[PDB]
Amino acid sequence: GSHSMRYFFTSVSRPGRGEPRFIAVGYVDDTQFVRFDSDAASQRMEPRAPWIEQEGPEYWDGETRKVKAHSQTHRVDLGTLRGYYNQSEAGSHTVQRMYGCDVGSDWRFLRGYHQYAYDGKDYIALKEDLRSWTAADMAAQTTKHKWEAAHVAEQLRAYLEGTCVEWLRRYLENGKETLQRTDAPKTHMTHHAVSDHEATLRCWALSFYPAEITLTWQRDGEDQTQDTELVETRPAGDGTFQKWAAVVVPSGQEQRYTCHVQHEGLPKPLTLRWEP
Amino acid sequence: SLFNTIAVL
């Protein structure tokens, strides 16, 4: 299956209170492997998966160097954006950046991407071709003309194809027993009387990885898109994910309803019905 | 690993 490596960064100003709060996390697929927090003791990039602990001091030095540089670029970006939008020194604002790599089954490059937001709204992103930027407003156009002049996209493309992918390949080998494992969902179904005439049927997927899943209900084969309560897919806390889908149904008409479970780790899609 | 030459706005 495909794999991704993705870095997420958040910087939040706090006039009066010091340097902005800066938080960085790295992921391979749905698994966190690295962390940096600007208010923590160490002032280092820190390990968050067993398989990254194997890297030596030359790696943590490099990753600490660069993560610090990202935090310093956000510090400036906050100031610059404050100026372009004419906002006051006292208010508190946020930048967010996410970039990374995808690869296919073959582990060859598939797509790369880099997105950026100020106060939760898109500011600028790199297009699919990794050669040009899409720009939110007149402030983003300014930044795009500047980055064109400075060959920024070209530098980032080199990384996105190339370096990013090579590290993703290495993390996937070193961490083979957790990253290349696919846990299929353990399923079950539940039934609650709502007073007279109606019952809830709730369909569960627990203990699965990766987080991608589709859970649907059908009555007599026909999809219940409108009627079904879904919950956002959610972390269990142990590397694995949980999800459920509920539907309300008329009493004694529950055999008509069937729950459909799709996941990478299932050979074929699962079908379940109420078995009292 | 992280990209090195991350650019400012």
Epitope: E58, G62, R65, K66, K68, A69, Q72, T73, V76, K146, W147, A150, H151, V152, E154, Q155, R157, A158, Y159, G162, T163, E166 | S1, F3, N4, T5, A7, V8
Partner: T-cell receptor
Framework: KEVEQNSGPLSVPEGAIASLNCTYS??????FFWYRQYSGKSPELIMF????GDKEDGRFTAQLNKASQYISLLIRDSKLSDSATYLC???????????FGKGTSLLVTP | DAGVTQSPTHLIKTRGQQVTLRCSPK?????VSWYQQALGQGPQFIFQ???????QRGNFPDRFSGHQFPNYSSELNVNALLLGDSALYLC???????????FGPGTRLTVTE
């Protein structure tokens, strides 16, 4: 020994194409540059390459091959003004320093 | 409103002495990298400074130290001078957009007997 260039001098007849090669060992090498240094002076950026392939700028062509781990500079229509030391520099993804070759001296023989 | 600056232009010192080299970056530039270029050799990275701290350091001994001030200018200090410290000391400035390094005119240090 991380970035390798021959010292030369290398000679190229005036008007002819001059060829300079440079070799590197670190697989994380990401960004490549060629500097020119005239006798008694400091180095001057003349070309950057961030992408595998050929890159043309005026009389200069740079060629990068990251699989074979070389990088070349070709100078068409050589002038006497082109006689100088050419230094090859490389930047890895782990940081912000340049690692440089020792410099190949070019003499364009008139 | 112009290019990279270094002083002094040339220095003559004897063994065991101390020197301070100054560098100012180009006008849009906020990072400064020092290099040592020995005769017939390529520049060897000493340090890079950004926002007044040492971002990265090379392979040079404790004798070499440095600093960057609020106006982004920088100093290289080297102590306990050896004859072998004779070199062109090059300062190079970069911004944080393109990251290309542009070298200054250099201080030529000679350490003599």
């Amino acid at each position: 020994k991380e970035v390798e260039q021959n010292s030369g001098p290398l000679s190229v007849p005036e008007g002819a194409i001059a060829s300079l090669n440079c070799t590197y060992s670190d697989r994380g090498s990401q960004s490549f540059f060629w500097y020119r240094q005239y006798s008694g002076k400091s180095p001057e950026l003349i070309m950057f390459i961030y992408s595998n392939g050929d890159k043309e700028d005026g009389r200069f062509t740079a060629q990068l091959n990251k699989a074979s781990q070389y990088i070349s500079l070709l100078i068409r229509d050589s002038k006497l003004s082109d006689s100088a030391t050419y230094l090859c520099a490389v930047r890895t993804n782990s940081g912000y320093a340049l690692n440089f070759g020792k410099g190949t001296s070019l003499l364009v023989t008139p | 409103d112009a290019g990279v600056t270094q002083s002094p232009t040339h220095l003559i010192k004897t063994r065991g002495q101390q020197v301070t080299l100054r560098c100012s970056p180009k006008q849009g530039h906020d990072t400064v990298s020092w290099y040592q270029q020995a005769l017939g050799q390529g520049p060897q990275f000493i340090f890079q400074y950004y926002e007044e701290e040492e971002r990265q350091r090379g392979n040079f001994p404790d004798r070499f130290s440095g600093h960057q001030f609020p106006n982004y200018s920088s100093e290289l200090n080297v102590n306990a001078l050896l004859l072998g410290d004779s070199a062109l000391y090059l300062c190079a400035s970069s911004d944080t957009v393109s990251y290309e390094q542009y070298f200054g005119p250099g201080t030529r240090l000679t350490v003599t007997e």
